[PDB]
Amino acid sequence: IRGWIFGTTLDSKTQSLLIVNNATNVVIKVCEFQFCNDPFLDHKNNKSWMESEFRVYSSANNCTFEYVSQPFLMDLEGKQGNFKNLREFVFKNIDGYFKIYSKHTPIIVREPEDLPQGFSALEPLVDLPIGINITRFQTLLA
Amino acid sequence: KVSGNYNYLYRLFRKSNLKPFERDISTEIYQAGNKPCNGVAGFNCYFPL
Ligand SMILES: *[C@@H]1O[C@H](CO)[C@@H](O)[C@H](O)[C@H]1NC(C)=O
Numbered sequence: 483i484r485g486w487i488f489g490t491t492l493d494s495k496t497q498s499l500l501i502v503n504n505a506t507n508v509v510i511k512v513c514e515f516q517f518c519n520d521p522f523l524d525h526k527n528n529k530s531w532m533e534s535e536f537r538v539y540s541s542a543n544n545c546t547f548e549y550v551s552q553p554f555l556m557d558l559e560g561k562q563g564n565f566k567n568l569r570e571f572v573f574k575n576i577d578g579y580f581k582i583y584s585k586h587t588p589i590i591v592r593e594p595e596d597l598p599q600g601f602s603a604l605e606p607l608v609d610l611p612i613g614i615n616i617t618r619f620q621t622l623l624a
Numbered sequence: 625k626v627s628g629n630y631n632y633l634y635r636l637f638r639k640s641n642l643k644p645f646e647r648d649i650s651t652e653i654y655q656a657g658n659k660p661c662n663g664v665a666g667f668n669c670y671f672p673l
């Protein structure tokens with residue numbers, strides 16, 4: 483999972499979000515986007531993941547916000563089975579402020595999986611003065 | 625400007641209100657009545673701003 487897209491129409495008619503992790507940083511863009519039908523950065527070979535198709539948007543017209551900061555924890559290579567990482571976020575916009583709360587936990591040894599039990603609290607991460615409307619979101623497999 | 629400057633614009637017709645500290649840059653024809661407006665400058669279909 484690379485990031486998320488937030489919006490209401492996603493057809494260059496209304497402004498929209500784009501959050502995605504790359505390189506050793508993060509990029510968050512608020513802009514009018516002409517999003518393609520299928521949103522991915524997967525495809526260039528058979529199996530070794532490639533960051534191909536960097537511009538999932540056909541074009542980028544007048545934007546409003548730009549932001550680059552310290553990225554999140556990264557998992558190298560592709561491993562199947564015994565998934566030791568859990569990452570949980572909450573996303574909410576109120577009063578024109580976008581709040582993202584993030585939490586990371588290691589050493590998940592639950593083979594059956596199905597969203598783990600117990601208890602954990604989430605810390606504030608960042609607040610963005612975006613000031614737009616938001617109705618629907620997706621996830622950016624890439 | 626002495627002749628008149630039109631760089632400053634205001635939105636006049638809109639379906640609903642604005643939540644606090646929220647920006648709207650959309651520019652689409654606003655339907656005054658029950659009649660469809662597929663994009664026209666005619667009856668009951670007016671520019672928003
Ligand atoms: C993200 O970083 C990678 C590696 O530096 C680069 O190839 C890619 O173009 C970047 N994408 C964006 C949207 O910054």
Ligand SMILES: *[C@@H]1O[C@H](CO)[C@@H](O)[C@H](O)[C@H]1NC(C)=O
Nearest residue numbers: 526527528529530531532534
């Ligand atoms: C993955 O793609 C890269 C170039 O994008 C290529 O060099 C590499 O051989 C590919 N790996 C596989 C397993 O196809």
Ligand SMILES: *[C@@H]1O[C@H](CO)[C@@H](O)[C@H](O)[C@H]1NC(C)=O
Nearest residue numbers: 490615616617640641642643
């Ligand atoms: C945001 O967009 C939705 C879908 O068009 C709309 O129902 C809602 O009223 C909008 N929010 C506003 C105008 O504050």
